[PDB]
Amino acid sequence: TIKDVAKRANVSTTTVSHVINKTRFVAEETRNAVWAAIKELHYSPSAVARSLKVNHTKSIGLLATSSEAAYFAEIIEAVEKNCFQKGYTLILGNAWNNLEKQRAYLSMMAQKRVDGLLVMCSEYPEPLLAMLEEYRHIPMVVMDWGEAKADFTDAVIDNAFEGGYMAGRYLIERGHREIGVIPGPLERNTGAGRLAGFMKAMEEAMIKVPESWIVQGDFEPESGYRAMQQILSQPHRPTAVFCGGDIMAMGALCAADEMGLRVPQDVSLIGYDNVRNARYFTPALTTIHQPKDSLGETAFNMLLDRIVNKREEPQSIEVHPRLIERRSVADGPFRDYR
Amino acid sequence: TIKDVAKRANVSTTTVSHVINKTRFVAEETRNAVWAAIKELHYSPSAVARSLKVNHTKSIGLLATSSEAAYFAEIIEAVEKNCFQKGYTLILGNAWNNLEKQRAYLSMMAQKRVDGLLVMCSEYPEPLLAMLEEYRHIPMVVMDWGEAKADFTDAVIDNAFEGGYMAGRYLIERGHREIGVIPGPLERNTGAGRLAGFMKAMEEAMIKVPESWIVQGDFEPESGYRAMQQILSQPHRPTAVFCGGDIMAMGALCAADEMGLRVPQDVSLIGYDNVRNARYFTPALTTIHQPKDSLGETAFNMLLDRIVNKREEPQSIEVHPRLIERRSVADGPFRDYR
DNA sequence: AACGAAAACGTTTTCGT
DNA sequence: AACGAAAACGTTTTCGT
Ligand code: HPA
Ligand code: HPA
Numbered sequence: 001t002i003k004d005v006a007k008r009a010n011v012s013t014t015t016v017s018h019v020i021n022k023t024r025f026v027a028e029e030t031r032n033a034v035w036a037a038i039k040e041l042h043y044s045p046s047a048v049a050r051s052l053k054v055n056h057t058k059s060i061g062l063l064a065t066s067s068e069a070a071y072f073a074e075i076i077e078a079v080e081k082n083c084f085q086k087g088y089t090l091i092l093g094n095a096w097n098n099l100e101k102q103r104a105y106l107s108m109m110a111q112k113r114v115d116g117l118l119v120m121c122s123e124y125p126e127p128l129l130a131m132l133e134e135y136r137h138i139p140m141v142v143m144d145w146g147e148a149k150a151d152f153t154d155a156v157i158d159n160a161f162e163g164g165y166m167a168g169r170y171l172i173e174r175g176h177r178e179i180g181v182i183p184g185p186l187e188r189n190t191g192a193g194r195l196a197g198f199m200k201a202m203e204e205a206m207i208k209v210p211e212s213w214i215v216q217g218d219f220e221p222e223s224g225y226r227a228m229q230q231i232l233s234q235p236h237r238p239t240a241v242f243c244g245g246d247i248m249a250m251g252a253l254c255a256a257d258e259m260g261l262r263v264p265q266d267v268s269l270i271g272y273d274n275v276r277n278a279r280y281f282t283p284a285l286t287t288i289h290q291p292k293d294s295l296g297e298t299a300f301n302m303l304l305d306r307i308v309n310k311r312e313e314p315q316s317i318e319v320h321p322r323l324i325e326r327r328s329v330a331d332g333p334f335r336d337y338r
Numbered sequence: 339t340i341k342d343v344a345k346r347a348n349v350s351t352t353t354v355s356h357v358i359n360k361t362r363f364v365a366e367e368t369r370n371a372v373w374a375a376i377k378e379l380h381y382s383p384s385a386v387a388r389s390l391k392v393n394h395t396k397s398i399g400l401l402a403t404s405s406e407a408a409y410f411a412e413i414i415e416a417v418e419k420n421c422f423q424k425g426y427t428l429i430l431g432n433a434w435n436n437l438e439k440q441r442a443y444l445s446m447m448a449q450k451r452v453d454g455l456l457v458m459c460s461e462y463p464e465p466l467l468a469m470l471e472e473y474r475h476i477p478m479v480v481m482d483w484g485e486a487k488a489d490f491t492d493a494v495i496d497n498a499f500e501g502g503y504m505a506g507r508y509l510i511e512r513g514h515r516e517i518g519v520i521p522g523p524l525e526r527n528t529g530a531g532r533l534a535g536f537m538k539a540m541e542e543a544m545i546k547v548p549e550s551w552i553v554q555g556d557f558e559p560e561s562g563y564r565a566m567q568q569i570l571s572q573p574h575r576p577t578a579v580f581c582g583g584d585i586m587a588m589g590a591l592c593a594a595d596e597m598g599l600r601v602p603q604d605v606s607l608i609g610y611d612n613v614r615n616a617r618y619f620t621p622a623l624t625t626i627h628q629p630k631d632s633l634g635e636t637a638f639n640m641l642l643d644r645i646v647n648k649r650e651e652p653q654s655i656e657v658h659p660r661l662i663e664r665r666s667v668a669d670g671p672f673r674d675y676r
Numbered sequence: 677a678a679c680g681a682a683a684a685c686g687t688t689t690t691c692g693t
Numbered sequence: 694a695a696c697g698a699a700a701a702c703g704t705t706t707t708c709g710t
Contacts, residue, residue, distance in 0.1 A: 002687060012697050017688060027695065042472075047449040048395065049686035052386050053702050059429075059450070067405070068415040068614060077406040080432055084443075089450055091397075092430045094418055105422075111385040112397070112427055134380075221618040247615070254618040276406060277585070280559040280592040282620050340704060350680050355705060365678065387703035391685050680709085692697085 001043060008037035020045055051113070059089035060303070061114035063105055065122045066094050069219065070247055070275040071292075072120070075143070078296030079118060086304060088115070097123055103131055110138060116303040119153075120144050123187040139306040143299045146189035148316050154302040155316040156295060160189055163288045163321035164197020167270055170286075170323060171240050172205050175332030176268065178238040180213035182227040182252065184245050191244065194272060198242055213238055217248045224251030232259055232267065239332055240268035246275040246287055253281060253328075264330040274324050284326035291319050339381060346375035358383055389451070397427035398641070399452035401443055403460045404432050407557065408585055408613040409630075410458070413481070416634030417456060424642060426453070435461055441469055448476060454641040457491075458482050461525040477644040481637045484527035486654050492640040493654040494633060498527055501626045501659035502535020505608055508624075508661060509578050510543050513670030514606065516576040518551035520565040520590065522583050529582065532610060536580055551576055555586045562589030570597055570605065577670055578606035584613040584625055591619060591666075602668040612662050622664035629657050 006013040011030055018024045019034045026034075037043075051057045060083055067073055076092070083090045091114060093105035102121070109117065117140040121128065124145070132140075133152055141154035148155045171179055181198060185191035202209060215230050217223035224243060228251070231237060243249040249271035256263050263269055263283060271278065274289030298317055305311055344351040349368055356362045357372045364372075375381075389395045398421055405411055414430070421428045429452060431443035440459070447455065455478040459466065462483070470478075471490055479492035486493045509517055519536060523529035540547060553568050555561035562581060566589070569575060581587040587609035594601050601607055601621060609616065612627030636655055643649055 013687080014689080014697060014699095015695095018696090021688085023688085025695075030695085044445070044448045046451065046686055047446075048386055048390050048451055049702090050688075051702095052390050052686075052704090053688050055702080057386065057450075066415065067418065068408075068411050070406075070408075073406050073411050077404065077432065080405065080430060084431070084439075089446060090430050092418060092428050093422070094415065101422075107382070108385075108427060110382045112395075113384065113386055221615045225618065250615070251618045254620050254622065257620045277559045277588070280563065280589045282592050282595045284592065351704080352680060352682095352706080353678095356679090359705085361705085363678075368678085384703055387685090388705075389685095390687090390703075391705050393685080678710105681707105683705100683707090685704085687702085688700100690698105690700090693695105 001041075002045070005034065005037045005041050005043050008041055009033045056115050057089070057113050058087060059091060059112070059114055060116050060118060060300075061091040061093060061109040061112070062118045062120070063093050063095060063102070063109065064120045066096055067092065070277075071219070071245065071273050071290075074276055074292045075120070075296050078293045079300055082297050082300040086300070095121065097121070099127055102128060106131060106135060110135060114138065116140060116307050118143060118299055118303065123185070124149060139303060141299050141303050141306075143295060144189060146193045148314070151314055153314060154306065155314075156299050156302065157316055157318045158189070158290065158295065159318055159320050160193035161197035163272060163290070164194040164199070165201045166197070166321065166323055167194075167242050167272065167288050168198040168201030170329070171242065171268070171270060171332070172201060172207070173338075174240075174268070174329055175335030176240040177205075177207055177332065177334055179207060179209065179240050179242060180215075180231045180238040181209065181242040182215050182217045182224060182231075182244055182248060184217050184219045184248065186216070194244055210236075217244055219245045219248055221247050221251030221254075224248030225255050228252040228255040229259070232256065232261055237267075240329070241270070243269060243271045246271045246273040246278045246281075246285065249278075249285060249287070250281055264328050268329040268332065270329055279326060281328070283328050286326040286328045287324055288321050289324045290321055295319050339379075340383070343372065343375045343379050343381050346379055347371045394453050395427070395451050396425060397429060397450070397452055398454050398456060398638075399429040399431060399447040399450070400456045400458070401431050401433060401440070401447065402458045404434055405430065408615075409557070409583065409611050409628075412614055412630045413458070413634050416631045417638055420635050420638040424638070433459065435459070437465055437469075440466060444469060444473060448473060452476065454478060454645050456481060456637055456641065461523070462487060477641060479637050479641050479644075481633060482527060484531045486652070489652055491652060492644065493652075494637050494640065495654055495656045496527070496628065496633065497656055497658050498531035499535035501610060501628070502532040502537070503539045504535070504659065504661055505532075505580050505610065505626050506536040506539030508667070509580065509606070509608060509670070510539060510545070511676075512578075512606070512667055513673030514578040515543075515545055515670065515672055517545060517547065517578050517580060518553075518569045518576040519547065519580040520553050520555045520562060520569075520582055520586060522555050522557045522586065524554070532582055548574075555582055557583045557586055559585050559589030559592075562586030563593050566590040566593040567597070570594065570599055575605075578667070579608070581607060581609045584609045584611040584616045584619075584623065587616075587623060587625070588619055602666050606667040606670065608667055617664060619666070621666050624664040624666045625662055626659050627662045628659055633657050
C-alpha cells in the first residue's frame with residue numbers, strides 16, 4: 001500500500017516514507033503530490049510493518065489484577081492519560097491473581113513485543129516473582145510493592161505503613177482508645193502494610209487490639225459489610241474503626257446503618273484510599289488519601305526513562321499518603337483528657 | 339531469532355514454525371529438539387512478524403469515553419474477560435468526548451491494525467459519525483446507541499426508554515404523584531432515552547413535571563449533589579425522585595442527608611444502572627438494572643462474528659433493563675387509593 | 677514419510693549520484 | 694539539490710522431492 005501510494009504519486013516509496021515521517025527534505029511539489037495520493041488512496045500507514053523494522057511498538061502493557069475496583073480503576077485511567085500523551089498505546093490485561101492467567105498475558109505481551117511493562121499484581125508469590133524475572137529483558141515497573149522485592153525492576157513505593165500509622169494516630173488523638181480494624185488481604189502491601197502502620201501507633205499508645213476486633217477484608221464492600229457486623233455484633237464493641245480501604249468502608253457504613261447504629265455518633269469510622277467519591281459516602285468519609293494519579297504518572301515515567309534513556313539500573317520512588325478529614329469521625333472518650 | 343532456533347536444532351525455520359504452530363506433522367525427535375532450543379534460546383515468537391504475514395493482529399481496540407466511572411468500568415472489565423478467553427489483546431483508549439482525541443486514537447488504532455473496533459463514545463455528533471465511517475472497513479460495533487444511527491456497524495441496543503418507563507411506573511404504583519428527575523446528558527442515549535421512558539409513564543398518568551423539578555446531571559456524583567439540593571431547596575418539593583444514574587444517585591443521597599432529610603422517609607429515590615455496589619449505598623438503592631456483562635459479551639460477539647465469519651451486513655441486538663427493589667423507596671400518598 | 681528453499685508481507689534506511 | 698534501488702526486519706507457506 002505504501003507502494004500504491006508511491007505510484008499514484010510517481011515517486012519512490014522511499015520518498016513517500018520520507019514525507020510521511022518528515023525524515024529528510026522533500027520538495028513542496030513532491031510533498032504535496034504524496035499527500036494527495038495519501039489521501040485519495042485513503043492510506044493508513046502500517047504500524048505493524050513499521051515496528052517490524054524500527055524495533056519498538058510504541059505500546060505499553062498493563063498487567064493488572066482487575067479493573068472494576070475504584071482504587072485500581074482510578075490508577076488505570078491515570079496511566080492511560082499518560083500513554084496517550086506521550087504517544088503510547090495501552091494494552092490492559094487483568095490476571096485476577098491467577099498464576100496461569102498471569103503466565104499467559106505475560107507471554108502474550110512479550111510476543112506482541114510491548115516496549116515496557118507496568119505491573120500491578122497485588123500478590124507476589126515466589127512463583128510469580130519467578131516468571132516476572134524471565135522477562136527482565138522487557139523493561140518494567142512494579143506499581144504496588146512496599147519495599148523493593150527485586151533487582152530486575154523499577155518500583156514506585158506508597159508508604160502504606162506511614163498511612164496506617166497516620167490513621168491510628170488520628171483516632172488516638174480524637175479520644176479513642178477502643179479501636180477495631182478490618183484490614184485488607186495480608187498478602188498485599190496495602191493489606192499488611194497499612195495494618196502494621198496502624199498497629200505501631202497502637203503499641204505506641206499502649207492500646208491493645210482484642211483479636212475479636214480485627215477482621216480480615218478483601219477490599220470488596222461485601223467484606224466490609226460482614227466485618228462491621230461481626231464487630232458491632234458483640235457484647236463489648238469499640239468506638240472507632242479503622243477500615244483498610246474505602247470501598248469496604250462503604251460496606252462497613254451500610255451495616256452500621258442496618259443495625260441502626262449511627263456514624264459517627266455511635267461508631268467512628270476511618271478509611272483509606274480516598275477514592276474519587278468517598279466524599280459522597282454518607283457520611284462524607286474521613287480517610288487517608290493515596291496519590292493515585294501520581295502513582296500512575298510516576299510509574300509511566302520511570303518506564304519511559306528506562307525505555308528511552310535505556311536504563312539498566314533499578315530504581316524506586318516513594319510517594320506519600322495523607323489524611324483527609326471529612327465527617328465520619330467524632331471525638332472519643334479521652335479527647336479532653338490529654 | 340526463529341533462525342536462531344532453527345540452527346541450535348539443526349532443522350529449518352520452516353520446521354520450527356511448523357512445530358510451534360502444529361501446522362503439519364513433525365517427528366517427535368524433531369519436535370523435541372525444537373522445543374529444546376526454543377527453550378534454552380529462551381525464544382519468544384514475534385507476533386509482530388507473524389501478523390505482518392497472516393494479516394491480523396488478534397487484538398481489539400476499545401475506543402471509549404472514560405474508564406473510572408463505575409458504569410463504564412464494569413462494562414470494560416467484561417469486554418476484557420471476553421478478549422482474554424477468545425485469545426484477543428485489548429487496547430483501551432479514552433477519548434473523553436473530544437473529537438481530536440477521538441480522531442487520534444481512531445487512527446492510532448487503524449495503524450496498529452486492530453482486527454475490530456468496539457465503540458463507546460457517549461455522544462455522537464455528525465462530525466464523529468463521519469470519522470467513524472471512514473473506518474467502515476475496520477469491523478466495528480457501537481455499544482451505546484439507542485436506535486441504529488448508521489448502516490456501517492453493529493449495534494447493541496439497551497432499551498433505555500423502557501427502563502425510564504419502568505422507573506416512573508414504579509413510583510406511580512407506590513403512591514407517588516409528585517416526582518422530580520435529574521436526567522443525565524441529553525446528548526447521550528442513557529441520558530435522553532431514560533428520561534423519555536420516564537416521561538411517557540408520567541403523561542400516561544397525567545402527572546406533570548414542574549420544570550423546576552427537573553435538573554440536568556452529568557452522571558457524576560457531584561451533579562447529583564447539586565440537583566437534589568436544588569430540588570429539596572424549594573417551597574414545594576416532590577416526594578419522590580427519579581435519578582438518571584446510580585452514581586449521581588449516590589450524590590443525591592448525600593445531600594438529602596446533609597439537609598437532614600431522610601431517605602426514604604422524607605424523599606424516595608430511585609436510580610438507574612444497578613452498579614456493582616449500589617446495594618451498599620445507604621440506604622440500599624432501589625434501581626433499574628442494566629445488564630452490563632451481557633452488554634459486553636454481546637458486543638464482543640457480534641464483532642467476532644463479523645471478524646471471523648466475515649460478515650458484511652449490519653446487525654443489532656437488544657438487551658433488557660429490569661427493576662431491582664432495595665430500600666430507597668417507600669409508599670407515596672396515593673398508594674392506598676388505587 | 678518427513679522435511680527444505682525461497683518468496684512474500686509492508687515498511688525504513690543506507691548509499692548512492 | 695533532490696531523490697531512487699535494494700536490502701533487511703522476522704515470520705508463514707507454497708511447492709517441491
Ligand atoms: O488490592 C486492592 N484492591 C482494591 N482496592 C485497594 N486499595 C488498596 N489496595 C487495594
Ligand atoms: O454516560 C454515562 N456515564 C456514566 N455512567 C453512565 N450510566 C449510563 N450512562 C452513563
